[PDB]
Amino acid sequence: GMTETFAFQAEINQLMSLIINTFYSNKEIFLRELISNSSDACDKIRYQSLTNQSVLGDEPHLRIRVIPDRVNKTLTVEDSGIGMTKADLVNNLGTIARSGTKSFMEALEAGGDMSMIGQFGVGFYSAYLVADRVTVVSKNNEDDAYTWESSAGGTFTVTSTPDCDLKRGTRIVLHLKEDQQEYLEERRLKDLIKKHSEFIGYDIELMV
Ligand SMILES: CCNC(=O)c1cc2c(-c3cc(OCCN(CC)CC)c(Cl)cc3Cl)nc(N)nc2s1
């Protein structure tokens, strides 16, 4: 549809630039962060479903999917959680993330570690540890499907993008850095998902 371009404020620019360039050597934490976020998104819709049930609609199964694509060199994390509207995408990835981002960087300046990113509610940006481009396709019950995309150049785009395969929830598509192809391997991902699956209340499906 119509593509709108938005700018990141300075803190998010600084964070993205920090993360995309860092020599932090435990980059695998990105997966933990995205799965955690997917798990929380499933909680929001489940909560709604207790009071209504009709909120689930055509997508009753609350689950998380990890999908490597060796052909296009992408790794996807998708869920059937509550999803985000156009305003939610912007609000979540731009607006509400600012004070968390600021505090995160201050914690790093004071001896903190990159693995703490989730404490600040900005764990999503850990995606840039292994990706040079991240695409977020989302569908909330109260809006059309929208696609947010950024390559960390100071701007992001939000585009209406009809997608029948996403009835509700969020698909995060990581276009991996050239030196980060291990996260397309079946074994690597299996071992990583097993690490935290027992503590995630929803099915995590690895699609080979
Ligand atoms: C009803 C509205 N739906 C949502 O809010 C959803 C969000 C997300 C996110 C998600 C969450 C993020 O930050 C979470 C913490 N924030 C709250 C203080 C601080 C900004 C970010 Cl930065 C990016 C993404 Cl993609 N991820 C996923 N898989 N699903 C949803 S559904």
Short mmCIF file of N, CA and C in Angstrom, two decimals, residues 2 18 21 34 47 53 60 84 91 116 136 159 170 172 174 199-201 207:
data_model
loop_
_atom_site.label_atom_id
_atom_site.label_comp_id
_atom_site.label_asym_id
_atom_site.label_seq_id
_atom_site.Cartn_x
_atom_site.Cartn_y
_atom_site.Cartn_z
N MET A 2 0.41 2.26 0.76
CA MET A 2 1.17 3.50 0.94
C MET A 2 2.26 3.33 2.00
N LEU A 18 25.08 1.32 18.17
CA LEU A 18 25.87 0.56 19.15
C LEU A 18 25.77 -0.94 18.82
N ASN A 21 27.16 -2.53 15.47
CA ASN A 21 28.63 -2.48 15.36
C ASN A 21 29.41 -3.23 16.44
N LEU A 34 13.65 -12.17 21.36
CA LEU A 34 12.50 -12.19 20.45
C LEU A 34 11.44 -13.21 20.92
N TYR A 47 -5.18 -13.23 27.66
CA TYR A 47 -5.88 -12.42 28.67
C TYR A 47 -7.21 -11.93 28.13
N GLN A 53 -13.20 -14.59 24.27
CA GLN A 53 -13.07 -15.80 23.42
C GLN A 53 -13.13 -15.49 21.92
N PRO A 60 -7.10 -19.63 16.91
CA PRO A 60 -7.17 -20.05 18.31
C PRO A 60 -5.83 -20.52 18.92
N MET A 84 0.22 -5.92 16.66
CA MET A 84 0.32 -4.47 16.75
C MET A 84 -0.36 -3.80 15.57
N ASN A 91 4.67 3.37 18.06
CA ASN A 91 4.73 3.57 19.51
C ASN A 91 5.72 2.63 20.20
N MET A 116 21.69 -7.76 29.38
CA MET A 116 20.72 -7.11 30.27
C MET A 116 19.65 -6.33 29.51
N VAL A 136 9.29 -6.36 10.38
CA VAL A 136 8.30 -6.77 11.37
C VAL A 136 6.92 -6.67 10.74
N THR A 159 4.29 0.27 6.28
CA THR A 159 3.56 0.04 5.03
C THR A 159 2.39 -0.92 5.28
N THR A 170 2.54 -11.51 15.04
CA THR A 170 3.73 -10.80 14.59
C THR A 170 4.77 -11.75 13.97
N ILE A 172 8.64 -11.56 12.68
CA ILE A 172 9.89 -10.79 12.66
C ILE A 172 10.91 -11.51 11.77
N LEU A 174 14.52 -11.64 10.08
CA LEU A 174 15.89 -11.17 10.25
C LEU A 174 16.68 -11.53 9.02
N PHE A 199 10.44 -22.85 30.17
CA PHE A 199 10.01 -21.64 30.87
C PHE A 199 9.13 -20.71 30.01
N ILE A 200 8.76 -21.18 28.82
CA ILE A 200 7.85 -20.46 27.94
C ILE A 200 6.55 -21.26 27.84
N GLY A 201 5.44 -20.64 28.24
CA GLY A 201 4.14 -21.33 28.37
C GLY A 201 3.41 -21.65 27.07
N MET A 207 10.67 -24.91 12.37
CA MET A 207 10.25 -25.39 11.05
C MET A 207 11.45 -25.53 10.11
#
